[PDB]
A paper describes a structure:
Kivd, a thiamine diphosphate (ThDP)-dependent 2-keto acid decarboxylase, belongs to the pyruvate decarboxylase family and exhibits broad substrate specificity. Kivd, the key enzyme in this pathway, catalyzes the conversion of 2-ketoisovalerate into isobutyraldehyde, which has been identified as a bottleneck in IB production. KivdS286T is a key enzyme in the 2-keto acid pathway, catalyzing the conversion of 2-ketoisovalerate (KIV) and 2-ketoisocaproate (KIC) to isobutyaldehyde and isovaleraldehyde, respectively, in Synechocystis sp.
The 2.8 Å X-ray crystal structure of KivdS286T reveals a tetrameric assembly composed of four polypeptide chains. The tetrameric structure is consistent with the results obtained from gel filtration chromatography, confirming that the crystal structure of KivdS286T represents the biologically active form of the protein. Each KivdS286T monomer consists of three distinct domains. The N-terminal PYR domain binds the pyrimidine ring of ThDP, the central R domain lacks bound cofactors, and the C-terminal PP domain interacts with the diphosphate group of ThDP. The ThDP cofactor, crucial for the decarboxylation reaction, is anchored within the active site through interactions with the conserved GDGX25-30NN motif, which coordinates with the diphosphate tail and an Mg2+ ion. Interestingly, the adjacent dimer lacks these cofactors.
Residue numbers in the entry:
A (entry chain D): 1 to 181, 190 to 456, 477 to 528
B (entry chain C): 1 to 180, 186 to 342, 346 to 456, 477 to 528
The structure:
Amino acid sequence: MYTVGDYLLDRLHELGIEEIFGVPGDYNLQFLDQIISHKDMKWVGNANELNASYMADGYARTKKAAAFLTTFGVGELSAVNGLAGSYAENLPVVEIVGSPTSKVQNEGKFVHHTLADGDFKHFMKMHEPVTAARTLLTAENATVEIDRVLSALLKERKPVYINLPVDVAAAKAEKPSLPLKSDQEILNKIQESLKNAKKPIVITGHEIISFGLEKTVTQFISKTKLPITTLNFGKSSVDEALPSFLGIYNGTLSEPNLKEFVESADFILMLGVKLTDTSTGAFTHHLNENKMISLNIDEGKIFNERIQNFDFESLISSLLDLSEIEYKGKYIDKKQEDFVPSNALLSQDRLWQAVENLTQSNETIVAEQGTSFFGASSIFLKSKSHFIGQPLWGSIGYTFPAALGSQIADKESRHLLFIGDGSLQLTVQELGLAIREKINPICFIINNMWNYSKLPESFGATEDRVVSKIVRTENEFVSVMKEAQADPNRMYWIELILAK
Amino acid sequence: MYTVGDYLLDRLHELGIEEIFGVPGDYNLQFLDQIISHKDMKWVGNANELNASYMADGYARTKKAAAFLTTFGVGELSAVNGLAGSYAENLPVVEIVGSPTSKVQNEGKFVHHTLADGDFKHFMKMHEPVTAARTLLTAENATVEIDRVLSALLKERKPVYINLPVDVAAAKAEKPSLPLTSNTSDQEILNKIQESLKNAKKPIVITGHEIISFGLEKTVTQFISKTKLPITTLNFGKSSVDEALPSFLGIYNGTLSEPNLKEFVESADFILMLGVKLTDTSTGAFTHHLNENKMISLNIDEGKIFNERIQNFDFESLISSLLDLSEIEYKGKYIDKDFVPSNALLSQDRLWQAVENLTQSNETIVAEQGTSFFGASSIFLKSKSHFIGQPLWGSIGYTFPAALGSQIADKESRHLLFIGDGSLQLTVQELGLAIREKINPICFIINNMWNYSKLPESFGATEDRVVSKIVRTENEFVSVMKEAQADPNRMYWIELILAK
């Protein structure tokens, strides 16, 4: 039989979701079965819900849609932080919440995972400010409601919430039938501005990643040869290997040449950007609104004139159909110091120098808030690479599960995680999943309270699965980097000890 | 100078809170210092916020008030699930949330830990359905607001929320001078209770969780002692009376109750229910038979005298008044109510038989949902003992941090934790705190896939701090139980392997 559960899963498939994360609970058991049954969908169960939500986030970053399952009350409220972070940084994550039978909910009984007030609507209400759409399904409204909220996900690429009562998931429903899903004036104004500019700057941001427009932007920048920079909030919204990519613009913390280039530009095109404290060097950015066109998901501005009505995705896509754009100016001077290692102990500055030099193409780099994010975000990535950081929401522990989710999202991109020992502790339990799912990320755990080196062994990993290293010197670092990248079939668990 | 922070902490001292849990964050650092400075208050920092909230809950259960500190956004939303569970089971927990300077909040800036919408009020709104009172402090309203919400905590003994902006915590304030009877229908009620009790040929007192909430356990025990009244508790409120009393019957849990108790309770001619809430898991899936027509029930918010609702009364002093009843003495019969180990492997039923026989006085027993809770809740505790279970909210992982919090709350009560391997994983990181704070609980981890045995060693414990055991047989169990109870200066990490 085809059921509501089936409908939801097929819909999720259409969004490109191939794995669902989460945690079994009594009110979501039956639907969990349905996920198993669907051959086009794989269940990847976490240790805890919060980890699940983080892992779905990372998955969304790469796969461009994600979903995870929790249980009413205890599950959903565990995940809320981190669904919040998916709202803040605009990732398309579906949260499915298995709830008691509608019979139980209507009778308002004091059942487990409630406040024994017979109210089944509190937790959805609590999810209001961190979801673009929500629904409590019924047998009648199910197909309509699923479609409504998944549509909102497509529109906004912000997380959405579906409360799925046991019996509603098992109820019959009819398959698919139909799939789910001022621009001209704007384009001309952009094109006119670009033809006129003697020194333009494109600045792209997180919302580009949200809609998986990275390749569009890259292709746009390539043909035009337009100067481009990103914020750290949206690092990799363009291929950093392009010759017209300047580096990261981050207020007065920007490298001086980039800073001067950006802030002396005669035209600014900002795409999918939000200026936050940590992404603008504590608001020390100088982006004159009078010579700037900015486009975002929800709104945009043409030279201080707000625009309301447009389609963000296709408006960006249209940048490719512009014409007679070619930048003939200079850029900024880069640097070509090779990392030559010694037996010197590894320092922070040397680490990132080495990472930049040794990183390869087709890699995703994930960096946790703290020394790791600060160092890693300034790196120029290799061609066809990606970056995951969470500098707006800034939830510690995030990058570990996120890294794993992302790695699962794209097996073809080798993930390199940079996380501090302090932070890793908060989400370390997902090491279990890493071992089970036989995924192969390169994990660097920077030191500075437990002995993490021998953690894989504790979780039941052998040397055929995880390789554990300790690095103290430059030579050791180089060696282990190359060794790790040379072996795509094992996960690497590398403890860095940094000097001074 | 004396500050708002100081005010809050002095107020917290008056509630009897001697330790504050939580996690440092940039928006709560300065206030954290204030906790350190206060000699009558000790900071006990957790690994994660969720753990903190669970640990505060456990602390409240024993100390009868608790507090923990988180950081705006990421911190508070991490803890929300534990706070929800504190609301559900009615524990007096203060959540303090350090937030950005009021200057920043008013200017509505896109700072870290926000949704970059310049709204600072979302997260408090999300806490609405799980707090009895909430406040965003200002320099002006601080003393009033602190007192308002801490008063509500006193009234309802449900959790409360204080958002504390950096600058507001540092703002000048005066030491509190004043410290923190509703109706005379209390007198009528007492007489009706007394009249009913004198007349009853077979009365039953049933006490519940709300008794623990107000620390009325000793009152109830003294009441039952003088009168010799038959008493039973639900598992939702186990230990709301001293189970060692001769008139304590056991646990009433619907048709899952021991037959004699079941028949006693359900054939009673008068029922006095104090602080009771009937949930699915605490009745036998609602197989309780408590005739409302021969029953007086008192709760925090409301009560019923033979199907006549009362609204306005003081729960605490109304219970306290039960002691001033007179010419109450039960003259009736009660119900009818020893472990020899072998080399036989340890089974579930044998475990709890052994625990019941070997448990000592002045102990707290903490049991996680699943097998542990089912077995442990049926035990008769020794004199002056306590029980922690969370059968309403039923959040897995809870009992580990909760156990630790409770243990910190009362150093004089030896905690015995019974948790499943599955659940321990969710909150295991707090093992760090256990080692640091040099507390000495007896932890039984039922094994039912990582190597937990070597966990203390990982977290830096030596044999002088934690003793690690593996138990398979009955003899081994008895031996390790006695050995653990015989050594009050070390924590015990005991892995139970159960049979079929």
